[PDB]
Design a binder for this molecule. Sequence first.
Ligand SMILES: [Cl-]
Length: 112
Amino acid sequence: NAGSQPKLTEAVSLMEANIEEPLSTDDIAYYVGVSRRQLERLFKQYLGTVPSKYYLELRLNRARQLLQQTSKSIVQIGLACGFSSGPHFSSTYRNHFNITPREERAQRAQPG
Ligand SMILES: [Cl-]
């Protein structure tokens, strides 16, 4: 279970501190003190994915937070979350959340 895997939770905390300019997987591993292979094994075992893909999920969730709370353009938000084009940001966002960034912002005020 992830909370009982301190190395994995450490890596995730480090990733959370580096969203706009994300660390390479190798750099996460160096800073947490495991090999790259070991870091990959942790992510595969305790989260079910690879570190780079979890990092993308994290950056997409920060983007969702910005879509719900700012008037920053779609382009601005994509750049702030490490994306390098609008089409790349919006397409990956839509694949992940099954709505577009524009739809997420339109729906931010949903009162439940
Ligand atoms: Cl950041």
